[PDB]
């Protein structure tokens, strides 16, 4: 109902139709799967050290080249 | 109303056949005990006797009689895991197969599939010779042994070892297996 914070640890690359989406690796900070590292797609400027609020932590983005 | 129908089911315990030890292998639900007949369960040889080598051998047991809450089974067939035999067949080798219909000493009808993998490509006449050797060994074993002893030797690997030792004289081998067994009939 409030989501789970995750911390960005690595930048992979740009993607999307018009280069608007970035793929990152994040580490869960709270919840059932705290400590796991998964990759995600993010819209907007982002840098290492930012914190995202995920609404669910079971979907993983498909790897890009 | 549906969960009402689920409450009418009772659980029955399934046992392995007599010559495998007769150990418990699982449980199954049913409302009428007559409906449990002819059900089939598949278990690996590692579960019967614990050893991490024979985890790719699969045995099928079929329920034939129910008494109380217990179900007793018979041997029906054996097979090797598909992913296992799929990793044996490679290019620049030769695969030799033989399928035989046999009758054991005590009047059991069986169909047996054996397989041999050669180290390299070989000529077809050598394949025929190896297949003939396999046939002779299997016929002799079937004539000599009873049903239970034959099944135990086939699943343990004695027959394959004898086949490999005899067939080394035609060409060096890499593997030799009894690939599949199915029972067809039983004595009257």
């Amino acid at each position: 109902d409030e989501g789970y914070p995750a911390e960005v640890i690595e930048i992979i690359g740009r993607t999307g139709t018009t280069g608007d989406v970035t793929q990152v690796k994040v580490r869960i900070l709270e919840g059932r799967d705290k400590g796991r590292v998964i990759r995600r797609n993010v819209r907007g400027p982002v840098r290492v050290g930012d914190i995202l609020i995920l609404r669910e932590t079971e979907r993983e983005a498909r790897e890009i080249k | 109303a549906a969960k009402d129908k689920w409450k009418l089911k009772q659980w029955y315990v399934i046992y392995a056949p007599d010559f495998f030890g007769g150990v418990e292998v699982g449980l199954t639900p049913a409302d009428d005990p007559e409906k449990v007949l002819n059900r089939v369960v598949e278990v690996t040889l590692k579960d019967i006797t614990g050893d991490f080598l024979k985890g790719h051998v699969k045995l099928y047991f079929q329920v034939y009689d129910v008494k109380g809450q217990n179900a007793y089974t018979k041997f029906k067939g054996m097979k090797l895991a598909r992913s296992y035999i799929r990793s044996l067949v490679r290019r620049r080798t030769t695969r030799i197969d033989g399928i035989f219909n046999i009758t054991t000493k005590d009047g059991y009808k069986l169909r047996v599939m054996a397989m041999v993998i050669a180290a390299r490509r070989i000529q077809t006449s050598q394949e025929r010779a190896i297949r003939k050797i396999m046939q002779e060994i299997i016929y002799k074993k079937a004539e000599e042994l009873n049903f239970k002893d034959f099944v135990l030797e086939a699943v343990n690997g004695k027959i394959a070892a004898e086949i490999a030792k005899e067939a080394k004289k035609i060409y060096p081998l890499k593997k030799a297996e009894i690939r599949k067994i199915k029972v067809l009939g039983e004595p009257e």
Binding site: E58, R59 | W6, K9, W11, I14, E24, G26, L27, T28, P29, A30, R39, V40, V41, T44, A81, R82, S83
Partner: protein, 127 residues
């Protein structure tokens, strides 16, 4: 003791079916398909629909006393495609996350030894 069942997973390019039965396969515990959790025909084979269906099936199985399952996953096979769709792996992962133990995993796609003739003529679909 331990009640173990079997999870049959049917995965194609158009849908996904998850079917939990008992150890012998003759009694059905639960059954859920992609068309029972989504509204758009386009979303039936998506991984997310597979996750939802797997969660529903796992909950229904857990409430009835099942502890773990062995997995059998198949593509349509036969004269159709031999490759499972995108929802198989998502279905497998969701079952474990819901609380069920996982036994052995194998694929049981039916493969012909030169069987029958497929559709499309000798030129195939021309799109």
């Amino acid at each position: 003791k331990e009640k173990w069942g079997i999870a049959h997973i049917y995965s194609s390019y158009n849908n996904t079916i998850i079917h939990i039965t008992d150890i012998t396969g003759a009694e059905t515990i639960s059954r859920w398909s992609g068309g029972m959790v989504v509204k758009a025909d386009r979303d039936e084979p998506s991984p997310y629909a597979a996750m939802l269906a797997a969660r529903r099936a796992a909950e229904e199985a857990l409430e009835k006393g099942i502890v773990g399952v062995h997995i059998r996953v198949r593509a349509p096979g036969g004269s159709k495609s031999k490759t499972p769709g995108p929802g198989a792996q998502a279905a497998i992962r969701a079952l474990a996350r819901a609380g069920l133990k996982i036994g052995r995993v194998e694929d049981v796609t039916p493969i012909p030894h030169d069987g029958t003739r497929p559709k499309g003529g000798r030129r195939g679909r021309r799109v």
